Design a protein around this motif. Sequence first.
Motif, PDB file in Angstrom:
ATOM      1  N   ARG A   1     -13.390  -0.816  -2.268  1.00 10.32           N
ATOM      2  CA  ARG A   1     -12.365   0.171  -2.563  1.00 10.32           C
ATOM      3  C   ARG A   1     -12.206   1.118  -1.374  1.00 10.32           C
TER       4      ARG A   1
ATOM      5  N   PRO B   1      -1.475   2.678  -9.919  1.00  8.89           N
ATOM      6  CA  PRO B   1      -2.702   1.970  -9.574  1.00  8.89           C
ATOM      7  C   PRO B   1      -2.654   0.515  -9.928  1.00  8.89           C
TER       8      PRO B   1
ATOM      9  N   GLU C   1      -8.799   2.964   1.400  1.00  9.50           N
ATOM     10  CA  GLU C   1      -7.402   3.404   1.566  1.00  9.50           C
ATOM     11  C   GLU C   1      -6.832   2.584   2.690  1.00  9.50           C
TER      12      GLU C   1
ATOM     13  N   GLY D   1      -8.129  -2.539  -2.251  1.00  4.45           N
ATOM     14  CA  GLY D   1      -9.363  -2.985  -2.854  1.00  4.45           C
ATOM     15  C   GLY D   1      -9.351  -4.233  -3.694  1.00  4.45           C
ATOM     16  N   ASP D   2     -10.490  -4.415  -4.358  1.00  2.63           N
ATOM     17  CA  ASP D   2     -10.907  -5.643  -5.033  1.00  2.63           C
ATOM     18  C   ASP D   2     -11.673  -5.234  -6.281  1.00  2.63           C
ATOM     19  N   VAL D   3     -11.097  -5.477  -7.473  1.00  2.28           N
ATOM     20  CA  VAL D   3     -11.724  -5.089  -8.726  1.00  2.28           C
ATOM     21  C   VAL D   3     -11.751  -6.299  -9.650  1.00  2.28           C
TER      22      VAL D   3
ATOM     23  N   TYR E   1       0.871  -1.140   0.000  1.00  2.00           N
ATOM     24  CA  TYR E   1       0.000   0.000   0.000  1.00  2.00           C
ATOM     25  C   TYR E   1       0.926   1.211   0.000  1.00  2.00           C
TER      26      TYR E   1
ATOM     27  N   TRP F   1     -15.690  -2.577  -9.128  1.00  2.00           N
ATOM     28  CA  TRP F   1     -15.068  -2.582  -7.815  1.00  2.00           C
ATOM     29  C   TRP F   1     -16.038  -3.127  -6.791  1.00  2.00           C
TER      30      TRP F   1
ATOM     31  N   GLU G   1      -4.247   2.908  -2.019  1.00  2.00           N
ATOM     32  CA  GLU G   1      -5.471   2.212  -2.461  1.00  2.00           C
ATOM     33  C   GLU G   1      -5.465   0.748  -2.006  1.00  2.00           C
TER      34      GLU G   1
ATOM     35  N   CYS H   1      -7.055  -8.023  -6.452  1.00  2.00           N
ATOM     36  CA  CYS H   1      -7.321  -7.703  -5.053  1.00  2.00           C
ATOM     37  C   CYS H   1      -6.047  -7.682  -4.188  1.00  2.00           C
TER      38      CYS H   1
END
Length: 307
Positions: A190, A159, A192, A199-201, A153, A187, A197, A217
């Motif tokens: 999402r 990104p 911080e 998250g899981d897309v 992170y 997503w 960032e 992810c």
Amino acid sequence: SPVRLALIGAGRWGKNYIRTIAGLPGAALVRLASSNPDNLALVPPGCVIESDWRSVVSAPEVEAVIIATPPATHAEITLAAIASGKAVLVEKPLTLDLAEAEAVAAAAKATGVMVWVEHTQLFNPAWEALKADLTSIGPILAVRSEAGNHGPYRPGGVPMLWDWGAHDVSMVLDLMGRDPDSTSASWAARGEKDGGEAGDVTLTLAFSTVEAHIRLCNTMDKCRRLAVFGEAGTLVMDDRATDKLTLHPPQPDGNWPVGQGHALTVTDEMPLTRAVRLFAGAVRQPEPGPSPLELGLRVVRVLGACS
């Protein structure tokens, strides 16, 4: 006569190039421009240390340049290398910008300079073995992949969609032989974490009646897997498995096969070793190779469509 390579590295991006080049009998690292002092500690004796990347591309003895810098800097260095007549292996993603990608494509065309993009999967013997066995599974119905880890992170970091996504988008485009009819990103979660960032897309790429779903992810245990579902079988490549490439029965559901499957033979050359060995081997007798510039451009196009 070893092929004389130079490396332009910055940040985390030049991770294992120096050791890979050192182990290749047909190549030599003759100059190194790197911000990273851990990298500068690794040069062979005779390799010239440069603070300025421009001195690498102006070097008369350098035959080819490996560009392992942050991606926002790829287009400037690549254009300079091309302008100088030096073959380029640039790390993925080609760029983070379509217009820059197109500027690079145009310079390669105008000059004839060989430019490969380092999409590691396309140099993996397991991927080559999966493609060789595609008739076994019959017409493709679905494709899915998953890449996971715990971060890192990083505030303002490249990104995940671009950085990890370029790795899996290259695979899907290489498999399908064409560009998608549609591309979208969804997503699930999402947020911080530590200013970066988290998250899981899932990326969905449609190829007429066949969809590829690419899950990225950065909040889960380390994993890389893909599955190609056909009418007659399913091919899976999975890091957690004993076997690099397994044949499984056909499905309709698109779920990850449960069970061991039938292990297919895959040989053990490391993908990055293959990438640099092949690239160095093509410098003096150029060819498009398994991961051409045009593919890097097409990957950049899709990633921008998902952003």
